[PDB]
Ligand binder design. Structure first.
Ligand code: IHP
Lengths: 130, 367, 511, 514
């Protein structure tokens, strides 16, 4: 246990009046992606998720984000998914074969795998069972 | 019927510490998928955390340390060898691609949750990407570079006179205890394994220095503690701390390396015995910030954090895991709840009672 | 003890009585030889002996003297099954308690000790015979142990006979041994390289008139086993910079060969060879508590339970008797010597804590002798917050979970490597010295190593296999597989070949 | 114990049996006593025939060896009679020779002593001499001194001489002292007698007994008559109920079985340890958190030259004085960090320097200390367990001040916790809570236990013990109103009496030092 000014943190000064003063402004951090709605029915949500899945390959997260986008209204969400379908990472069979060969040569060193796979970022290699 | 907020960034799982490093940022992606497929995702507010700027980090950390963190890359490790030696970066805290972005996301989730709790806009805030409690003011320790718990508490201290920090990681929360060692505005309670163990601190005789004396509680443990003993010792201590300290906000660090069958831990807890702590803390009706921590058997971490998030929402989930993108990780039982091993509990009732009585005596000296 | 007080009356017991009595007996009956009441004539030489000592040392002479007969009570006793030299040896042992044992007269002393019921001498001669059993006397020693009801000598001779069965077939002594001894030989499990089937057919074809009826029982009890001899050579190669674990197989002619390899992707702080598997402990320096297990068949690494504590330079000892791996001593990450003892149950995959060491050491060498762990050398705790080389021996008795410190000390101090050959521990340290330690007799013996390699003060590692000790060099010069084969009986070293894996560094040698 | 080179365990080596001597002894005992075989000599004592073995007798004694060898007529004789030994004494000696253990009694002590000296039974003779010196008193001090003169025993001679010198006043008019030899009287007087004995009157009476021949010896006695001061002291300090100042009381107890106050001193410092070295008091004190102020200033020393403070800040440490090295040892203790300490330091009175020494095997605090001929015994105290707390201890530790080595005895004390020890005649008397008193014989590694009067045992009161001239005084920590509860114990007959007359006003007793 080290005690010093370069080890401890500089806590603020207690301001009883300033506690319940500034909690309405300044900066709200984070971006809202989904918010529950009580008026929404469970069955309607399940049906919308199922149709979004077996209509354009929308997972639960993407369909939920789309529903939040259109003010939690299913009708305007079932007629907006085909406008912009979210094509996922385009991993061609050739690129998968190169990934397998690079893994065989080098292993889990994605830095070396990127040398022979320069079109893919390291985050794409880490994201990419058998 | 409280309100729970959830912070998650989709790219947090694509950061790789390195080959053979026990720390896998992928345990949060599987937790998120289990939450999505269990139906708990639809029950809370979901936020995309902001990237904490370097100026926000230097509220606690030194400017030189944050500048080194921002400047170092795996490509230019040659010019910084003295800096890496000084800042404790490279051996166990490796230099990997996207290190600073990982730190920014982990810190931003916690700071945004603290801000949300400050404005009375939520009753609970969850961030499983945070909880790095080993980082020091000007150096890295224990797989951690930036201490986001300290910055989150510093955000909370703007609005709350007293903040209580509880740590149920199997390791001592040395980074958080050191930062708030000489202040009484934060009381740091820690349950940990002691005796020739990482990080080497957390003695029963460590109670605070100067103005913050008696405001640091430490409960050393032995090997193989189970659900019954942990429940017997957790609720009384926490109730006594509530009675004496009387805090206004709580920060709970739910480290999952105290579970049974961990790759780096030696306790014998289960998922239910881990979430009993969350159930007990939730009964005091104080603002709560639930953060992650350790945990090196990844499927157990996912199960534990999913069950704790269900506990926070006051929602029951079946023992049968649903279908998710990582269904092959949870085989062959495909159950949410785990079973304990057959290790012996070295925490005899006499030892536990002596430690509890000493802690009770220490807590009664609070001004 | 309640009415006893040192001011009126109490019981005084002299602790030096037995030693004084023994010394007086030796001094009176050796130098001056008075009060001789009996005469023993062996091969024409008369021994003037005392029947009190003879009856106190053996039940044979006690029953001869008490229950007197015609021969044992007239004037003299004549013994005809013992020669003069061995009888003089037994007289010296009886009167003085110290005897010089030579291998040239070992069997005769063994038999006569069995006849005269000198149980301690009998046990020592049996241990000597089990030490020095070889191919040419294997079946003779099996006969001797069977006739004299010696279980341990029987198992030693039978173990030596099963591993050289191929060479035994062409011998008449194997063709002439009866059925039962052959069942004991076969049942234990003969290695496949010895061709047990050919031996069975040869024995059954030696005389087919009254032996073919035994074919079914002999074939049914036949047992084949894999490769039970193994040495592990964890070290660093020139090309692969992570690590390398190399397996070694030793044949019946004492030659090592490489039987596999497995690269290690982690950094290792301790290693062990429980059974036929390899256990490594490591991970990182702040937390060196992760454990892995490897098998030559699987070519993989299975993670085991983590250590309850993280220490550096701890000792890993395998105890097959209780099926556990022990971790004793070590040095914590705060530069503090540790005295904790923890063991790992292989069947349960659980670590447990035991009683602590009397003295906290680090870097010690570990050896298991029939369920007893010996901690040799290492690093002791110096008074001025420093550490100094250690030269003491600690004895952790596994069965009763007790620890003791031997009053005597090792010839050398510091870091050393130990290997268990037969019932003895071979220890090697820096300085071209090889020490054979006998823990039952509390004695040491030095084997002189040639000074050709004294210029380089490198570490030395020793491993044993089926009758010889292999000595390894830590600092291998380029293109030189320098391994030497030691024969303990003649103390003659010999450069060996057959190793073609360029291991620049030798970190661990396991059994 | 080096590693041999001419011996290897695969060719030839030397086997030594470590169980040979015990087996030989057990077989000798069995054959000779349980079955009575191979007897070759007969010894007749007072008409009783003993069937013994010449080998066992000659292996134990040189008298019997020279008696038996004797290669003439007197060697090969049927029955040999012994005339200077009684039948019972010879039975005890035979039991000792054959079994190695004997039961010693004070009624036959002198006979066994003489016969063991005659028969060259060295260990039995030494044990009998220690027993004889243990139980010497006025009624046999001169007789024992003359007894040790014929047998040339220095230790017993000095013990009897000290006993006779301390009680010279009672022996001055006795009949035996009148016919004392001149050399014996010179040895008694020249040692240094207390001033209360009046040696001048004794020598005058001795001269007046025979003035014709002892007149020439008169001058030598006067020249060699040296006297000494009073050093038989008990230093007990304590705190009064209504006063916050510790008062140190010095006591002098004479040979007349009476103890009285010799003086009082007042100290205003809280005291954590104290010791009695020689005739003066040594006190260790200090204020929190610096309790290492060794005391050099008071009205008895009138000096202020900074007695060397202890180099370690410890509490509940043991102060044991070793007059052989003129040193005071501070062993064990508990440090301010609530951790037990195993540090040993000593303080040379002439050097005035504290020096560190080897550590103890275990760390204890509150352990009783006793010095027995240069060996320090730490008894009881508290030891760590459940490794953040302490547990009462029942361990014994030895610290040889000559070889500077520390050992832990295999056995343990019959009780555990906080104890007080007093050394009385080469024995350690240990008391604790429970009204049980234990006598410890380190040489024989045995305990004996007396039960102190349990009439008042419900009170949570501590017991202090201090030896004085053949009697043991037991002090009660919790004194009653108007009752100075002090008990005098005589260890020979285990009779505990009451010693009203000592006017201690100390309600609480902190330290009792002797
Ligand atoms: O040796 P480590 O660096 O500690 O990691 C390996 C492995 O990683 P590598 O393939 O890079 O060696 C992990 O797989 P990934 O995380 O890379 O997919 C996997 O652990 P998880 O299952 O938690 O992902 C495995 O452990 P396991 O045996 O449980 O598969 C773990 O350890 P090993 O050294 O035992 O292979």
């Amino acid at each position: 246990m080290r005690v010093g000014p370069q080890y401890q943190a500089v806590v603020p000064d207690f301001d009883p009046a300033k506690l319940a003063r500034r909690s309405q402004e300044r900066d709200n951090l984070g971006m809202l992606v989904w918010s529950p709605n009580q008026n929404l029915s469970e069955a309607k949500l399940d049906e919308y998720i199922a149709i979004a899945k077996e209509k354009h390959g929308y997972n639960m997260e993407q369909a939920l984000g789309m529903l939040f986008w259109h003010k939690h209204n299913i009708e305007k969400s079932l007629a907006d998914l085909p406008n912009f379908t979210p094509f996922p990472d385009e991993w061609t069979v050739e690129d998968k074969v190169l990934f397998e060969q690079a893994f065989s040569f080098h292993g889990k060193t994605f830095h070396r795998i990127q040398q022979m796979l320069p079109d893919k970022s390291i985050a794409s290699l880490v994201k990419f069972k058998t | 019927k409280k309100k729970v907020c959830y912070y998650y960034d989709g790219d947090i799982g694509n950061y790789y510490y390195g080959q053979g490093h026990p720390m896998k940022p992928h345990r949060i992606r599987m937790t998120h998928n289990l939450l999505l497929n269990y139906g708990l995702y639809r029950k809370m507010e979901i936020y995309r955390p902001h990237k904490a700027t370097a100026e926000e980090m230097t509220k606690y950390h030194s400017d030189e340390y944050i500048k080194f963190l921002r400047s170092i890359r795996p490509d230019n490790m040659s010019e910084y060898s003295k800096q890496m030696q000084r800042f404790n970066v490279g051996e166990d805290c490796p230099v990997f691609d996207g290190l600073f972005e990982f730190c920014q996301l982990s810190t931003g989730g916690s700071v945004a949750g603290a801000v949300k709790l400050n404005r009375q806009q939520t009753d609970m805030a969850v961030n499983w990407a945070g909880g790095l409690h080993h980082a020091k003011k000007s150096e890295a320790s224990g797989f951690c570079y930036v201490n986001d718990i300290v910055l989150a508490i510093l955000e909370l201290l703007k609005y709350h006179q007293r903040v209580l920090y509880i740590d149920i990681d199997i390791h001592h929360g040395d980074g958080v205890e050191e930062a708030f060692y000489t202040t009484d505005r934060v009381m740091t309670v820690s349950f940990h394994k002691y005796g020739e163990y990482f990080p080497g601190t957390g003695d029963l005789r460590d109670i605070g220095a100067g103005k913050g004396k008696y405001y640091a509680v430490n409960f050393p443990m032995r090997d193989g503690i189970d659900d019954e003993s942990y429940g017997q010792i957790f609720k009384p201590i926490i109730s006594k701390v509530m009675e004496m300290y009387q805090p206004s906000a709580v920060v709970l660090q739910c480290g999952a390396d105290s579970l049974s069958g961990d790759r780096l831990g030696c306790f014998n807890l289960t998922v239910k015995g881990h979430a009993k702590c969350v159930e007990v803390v939730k009964t005091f009706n104080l603002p709560l910030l639930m953060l992650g921590g350790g945990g090196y058997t990844i499927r157990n971490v996912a199960r534990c954090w999913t069950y704790e998030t269900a506990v926070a929402l006051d929602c029951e989930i079946p023992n049968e895991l649903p279908y998710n993108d990582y269904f092959e990780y949870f085989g062959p039982d495909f159950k949410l709840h785990i079973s304990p091993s057959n290790m012996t509990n070295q925490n005899t009732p006499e030892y536990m009672e002596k430690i509890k009585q000493r802690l009770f005596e220490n807590l009664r000296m609070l001004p | 003890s309640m009415d006893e007080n040192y001011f009126v009356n109490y019981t005084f017991k002299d602790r030096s009585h037995s030693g004084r009595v023994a010394q007086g007996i030796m001094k009176l009956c050796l130098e001056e030889e008075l009060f001789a009441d009996v005469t023993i004539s062996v091969e024409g030489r008369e021994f003037q002996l005392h029947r009190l000592v003879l009856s106190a040392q053996s039940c044979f002479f006690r029953s001869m003297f008490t229950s007197n007969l015609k021969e044992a009570h007239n004037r003299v006793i004549v013994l005809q099954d013992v020669s003069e030299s061995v009888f003089q040896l037994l007289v010296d042992y009886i009167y003085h308690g110290t005897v010089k044992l030579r291998a040239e007269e070992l069997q005769e002393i063994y038999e006569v000790s069995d006849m005269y019921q000198l149980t301690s001498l009998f046990e020592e001669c049996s241990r000597f015979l089990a030490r020095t059993v070889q191919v040419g006397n294997c079946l003779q020693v099996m006969w001797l142990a069977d006739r004299h009801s010696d279980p341990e000598l029987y198992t030693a001779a039978k173990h030596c006979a099963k591993t050289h069965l191929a060479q035994l077939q062409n011998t008449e002594e194997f063709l002439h041994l009866p059925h039962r001894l052959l069942t004991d030989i076969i049942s234990d499990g003969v290695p496949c390289s010895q061709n047990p089937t050919e031996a069975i057919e040869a024995w059954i074809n030696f005389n087919k008139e009254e032996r073919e009826a035994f074919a079914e029982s002999l074939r049914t009890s036949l047992k084949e086993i894999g490769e039970n001899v193994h040495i592990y050579l964890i070290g660093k190669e020139s090309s692969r910079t992570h690590s390398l674990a190399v397996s070694l197989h030793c044949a019946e002619d004492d030659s090592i060969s490489v039987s596999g390899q497995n690269s290690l992707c982690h950094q290792i702080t301790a290693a062990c060879k429980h059974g036929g598997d390899l256990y490594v402990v490591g991970g990182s320096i702040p937390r060196p508590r992760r454990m892995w297990k490897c098998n030559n068949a699987t070519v993989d690494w299975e993670w085991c339970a983590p250590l309850p504590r993280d220490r550096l330079q701890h000792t890993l000892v395998s105890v097959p008797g209780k099926d556990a791996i022990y971790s004793l001593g070590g040095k914590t990450l705060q530069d503090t010597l540790s005295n904790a003892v923890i063991y790992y149950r292989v069947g349960d995959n659980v670590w447990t804590e035991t009683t602590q060491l009397e003295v906290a050491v680090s870097g010690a060498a570990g050896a298991n002798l029939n369920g007893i762990i010996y901690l040799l050398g290492g690093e002791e705790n110096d008074l001025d917050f420093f550490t100094k080389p250690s030269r003491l021996i600690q004895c952790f008795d596994t069965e009763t979970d007790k620890c003791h410190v031997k009053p005597y000390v090792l010839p050398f101090a510091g870091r050393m490597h130990a290997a268990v050959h037969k019932d003895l521990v071979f220890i090697v340290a820096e300085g071209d010295s090889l020490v054979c330690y006998n823990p039952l007799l509390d004695s040491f013996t030095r084997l002189c190593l040639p000074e050709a390699w004294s210029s380089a003060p490198s570490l030395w590692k020793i491993a044993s296999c089926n009758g010889s000790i292999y000595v390894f060099r830590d600092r291998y010069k380029k293109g030189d597989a320098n391994t030497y084969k030691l024969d303990p009986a003649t103390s003659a070293v010999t450069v060996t070949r057959g190793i073609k894996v360029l291991l620049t560094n030798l970190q661990f040698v396991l059994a």
